[model samples]
Target: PPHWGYFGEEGPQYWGELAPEFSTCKTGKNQSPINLKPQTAVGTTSLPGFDVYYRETALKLINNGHTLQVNIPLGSYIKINGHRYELLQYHFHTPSEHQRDGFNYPMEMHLVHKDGDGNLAVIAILFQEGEENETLAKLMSFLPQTLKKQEIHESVKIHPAKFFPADKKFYKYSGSLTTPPCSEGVYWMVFKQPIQASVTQLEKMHEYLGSNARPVQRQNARTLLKSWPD
Candidate 1:
């Protein structure tokens, strides 16, 4: 079986060539982790504010040999432009996958959601080095003490609000998956106000995941939507 990792010969550069299903990684124009800049932004008084309906739900943490992922139970969702997408899971990427003004963050968290029609939406929260994030603290306590792939059967409750910025301003665009397959048509909303995490928290995460971030891809002809707080 073909395998992929974050280093050496099996890295992201070879993902498309690794398997037939991953051809988009090399050929797709709307790839994610973009370099968000003012020149590409279309400002608005407000883009429909997210109707977030997240609750404390049971979760399963797993180090899937790629990133530290949290498998979420149902009952959480977001409504935007009359479409509701249920929260599926969330994972982390060290040094962030997305950039702003050509600068990357200490880390980034992806909240993956899916609607009835199978369309995907992702909320990208960038993390900076500063005060400790209490929400992240809860999950970090359960990360496997080692860097190997493993599932922790422990159950944890997550509140999606904790994953967002107080000021709801954000940048939206169309992009593809950051991993293999690199499927396009994903609606991406990256919060403009970055969340804060302590240096210790970032270091702990880096110790486990190293750097699992995909480089920024070309913007092509996609429009970048800028939503501001009302």
Candidate 2:
């Protein structure tokens, strides 16, 4: 099996060539991490209402060599329109993968959910540098730096809701996974408002993750929709 990563040689640029299963990385027209331009987005009331049913869960953290991924215990899920997708796992990307007006933020976190049919819907929360984020502080207090694969601290707990910004309006689009395989058809909902993290908190999450973000890909002809009607 071939290995793919964030740097040169195994980087995003060569992901499609890395493996037969990863051909979508270069050929897919609906690639993700696009520049989320408000000027171009279509605001509509026709889209489904997004509902999150996230609950407090045991802290299951790990360094997956690619990114620091946290496993979500069962019982958490989100509803898009009338579709229910179970929360599986979530992870972080440093300096963010998606851009706002062509600029990057301090970080981005993806909460991945899946339906019974295997379709995916990702709720992305972007983090800016400002006040200290109490939710992240709780996780950091668990010593994430010492965290490795296959470790679960059942005593430590965190809530996914705390990571969300107060404003819930979002930009929706169809994009591929930022990682290789780069599979298309993934539904994306990026919050318009960015949550804040102190400079030190941002720096703390940057440890070991130098830059795991995949550069923004071409938007092609996809429609980028906002939740509110213009």
The best candidate by TM-score is: 2
- C-alpha lDDT (0 to 100) for residue 152 of candidate 1: 50
Per-residue lDDT, model 1, residue 156, is: 67
Residue pair clashes in candidate 1: none
The C-alpha RMSD in Å for every predicted model, in order, reads 2.1, 1.3
Each prediction's TM-score versus the true structure: 0.92, 0.96
- C-alpha RMSD between model 1 and the true structure: 2.1
Tens digit of per-residue lDDT, candidate 1, span 19-47: 88888988999999799986768987757
What lDDT score goes with residue 15 in model 2? 94
Off by over 4 Å in 1: 145-155
Q: What lDDT score belongs to each candidate, Candidate 1 first?
A: 0.86, 0.89
